[PDB]
Amino acid sequence: PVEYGIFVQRGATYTINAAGEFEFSGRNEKWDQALYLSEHFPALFSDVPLAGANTIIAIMRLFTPQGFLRTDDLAIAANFPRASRNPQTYIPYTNQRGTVTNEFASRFRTIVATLANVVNERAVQDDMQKATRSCTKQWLRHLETQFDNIAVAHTDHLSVVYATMSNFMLNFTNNFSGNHATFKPDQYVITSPEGSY
């Protein structure tokens, strides 16, 4: 509640000025998807540190993507239509072949570690029985194992499926730069001097 009050007193949204600084709204308000095409951003995803709101910032840091920004090289060689001057695609995770340990899965372990101490702090705050606590923890460990299982399927197989599809002919837009804080889609319009765009 207190970290929330600090956070939301900084404001629920922000814009990025020409200087590139994030100017926060300073005003609590619900987001609507209308704003998605606006100059506004949800503030939770600014990744701008805020004193006294650290736990919120950290739990937010859990959401940062584990992939990379590929260039659609094959689509370019084929002269497939691409609205961007430098066409690209955010592949959700890199291939990771030589490692003993999958970096994506290890990331999920750190996320689950963080959520674990979060749920723990909450449960001790609310005087939960040790048995239920142990059970949520067991559930989290299970999620870690399951994730370590599927991780190779994602990072090492599905990733290539993404890399191909990004080169398909009609996949013409740039979807995401991989940085939530700043990314907005380029917004083209058809524009008649007569009617509305």
Binding site: I16, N17, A18, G20, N179, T182
Partner: peptide, 9 residues
């Protein structure tokens, strides 16, 4: 550059 502002800095 990620943005024109970064290029400006």
């Amino acid at each position: 550059y990620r943005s024109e502002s970064d290029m400006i800095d």
